[PDB]
């Protein structure tokens, strides 16, 4: 049996209510009358944590803000008065038959818009003294999570050899961070001298530019 979750993502303002749905391909009603449906929350960097079992039974420790409902093949998790710590991926699961999970629903917290603090770093002497070259760019504490990063070498865009990494939403301030690493051969790196990390974000009308020149 498959369980389908919607929506894939869910933006919500603090204090507001949120609603998730998870659908089974078969009825979850066991022959013994009970419906074995679970809701979990997986906060960033942590394992899943049981919220609700048997459809609407709130597990020990779970705030009454979380409530389960539904029957047959249709179930819903409601969160009223969303706190920032609520963010993460929500999962439903059925153990009426052989255990299966939903694909999860990521809850995102709405906030006021924040420009990224951008910082660029040339390869370290240590790395260079090993025949390698990595240019690194941090784009920290921004919102919304949509951001476009370009690497420009001598004005010309480079997409090969880029490694991007995002942090999950930080419940502390509800922002996002990002790291972009441009890796080149030592010889290629020394063939140019202008290096640029370029971010396009809602918070700025023009590209947010951070550059350095070699020598």
């Amino acid at each position: 049996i498959q369980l389908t979750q919607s929506p894939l993502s869910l933006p919500v303002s603090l204090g507001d209510q949120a609603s998730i749905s998870c659908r089974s391909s078969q009825s979850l009603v066991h022959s013994n009358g009970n419906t074995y449906l679970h809701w979990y929350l997986q906060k960033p960097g942590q394992s899943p944590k049981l919220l609700i079992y048997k459809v609407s039974n709130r597990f020990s420790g779970v705030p009454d803000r979380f409530s389960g409902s539904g029957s047959g093949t249709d179930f819903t998790l409601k969160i009223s008065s969303v706190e920032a710590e609520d963010l993460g991926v929500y999962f439903c699961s059925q153990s009426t038959h052989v255990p299966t999970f939903g694909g999860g629903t990521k809850l995102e917290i709405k906030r006021a818009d924040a420009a990224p603090t951008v910082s660029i770093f040339p390869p370290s002497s240590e790395q260079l003294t090993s025949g390698g070259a990595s240019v690194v760019c941090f784009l920290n504490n921004f919102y919304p999570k949509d951001i476009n990063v370009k690497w420009k070498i001598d004005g010309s865009e480079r997409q090969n050899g880029v490694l991007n990494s995002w942090t999950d939403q930080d419940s502390k301030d509800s922002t996002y961070s990002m790291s972009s690493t441009l890796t080149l051969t030592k010889d290629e790196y020394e063939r140019h001298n202008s290096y640029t990390c370029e971010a396009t974000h809602k918070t700025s009308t023009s590209p947010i530019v951070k550059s350095f020149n070699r020598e």
């Binding site: 770093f121 790395q127 690194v136 941090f138 920290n140 490694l163 995002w166 690493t181």
Partner: protein
């Protein structure tokens, strides 16, 4: 306090074998329904195996994908259970969680990493990132497999820190961390990047020099 701590994970060659364990405390183990659940980019959360109540004769059931290859085990008097895996495949790779309780799946451990490889284990190169208020960095490049632990000033420096999830490319991982302090702080006070990579028994300190 309820605690589920996994252990024994790591790197294995395809066709290889591996045993992972879960140590339980804070609840009456013999009464508890236990599970192994694994997580991966593909497939997401997928149930692996279960071992039931003593009341229920410690009955075991396995996902069809691991049936005959994985053996689940438990010792109630030791509050311990294990997953002993054989003929491991690339898609067995994932984060393995120990889960259990009087209420099924009531508790979950931090998980242990199971990676079936062929790739060889490599220590990371640790590069200091000095700036061109002030933001410093640490680049951790070319290590296999996961995980590494990165810290600043042995943990003493934690606020203003952003550490990013490792990303794999050509059989190698790279990791980065940034820390933002005030101009009055550095280079006045030394700031040093600490990285451990158990798989290859490496612990590296890199001081951020202007």
């Amino acid at each position: 306090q309820v605690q589920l701590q996994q252990s024994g994970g790591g790197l294995v060659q395809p066709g290889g074998s591996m045993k992972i364990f879960c140590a339980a405390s804070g609840f009456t183990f013999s009464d508890a329904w236990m599970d192994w659940v694994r997580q991966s980019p593909e497939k997401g959360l997928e149930w692996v195996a279960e071992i039931r109540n003593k009341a229920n004769n410690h009955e075991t059931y396995y996902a069809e994908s691991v049936k005959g290859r994985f053996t689940i085990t438990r010792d109630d008097s030791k509050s311990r259970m294990s997953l002993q895996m054989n003929s491991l495949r690339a898609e067995d790779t994932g984060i393995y969680y120990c889960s259990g309780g009087k209420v099924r799946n009531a508790y979950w451990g931090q998980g242990t990493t199971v990676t079936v490889s062929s790739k060889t284990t490599k220590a990371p190169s640790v590069y200091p990132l000095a700036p061109v208020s002030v933001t410093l960095g640490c680049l951790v490049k070319g290590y296999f497999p996961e995980p590494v632990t990165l810290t600043w000033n042995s943990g003493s420096l934690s606020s203003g820190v952003h550490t990013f999830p490792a990303v794999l490319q050509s059989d190698l991982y790279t990791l980065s961390s940034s820390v933002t302090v005030t101009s009055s702080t550095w280079p006045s006070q030394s700031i040093t990047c600490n990285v451990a990579h158990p798989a290859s028994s490496t612990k590296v300190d890199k001081k951020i020099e202007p």
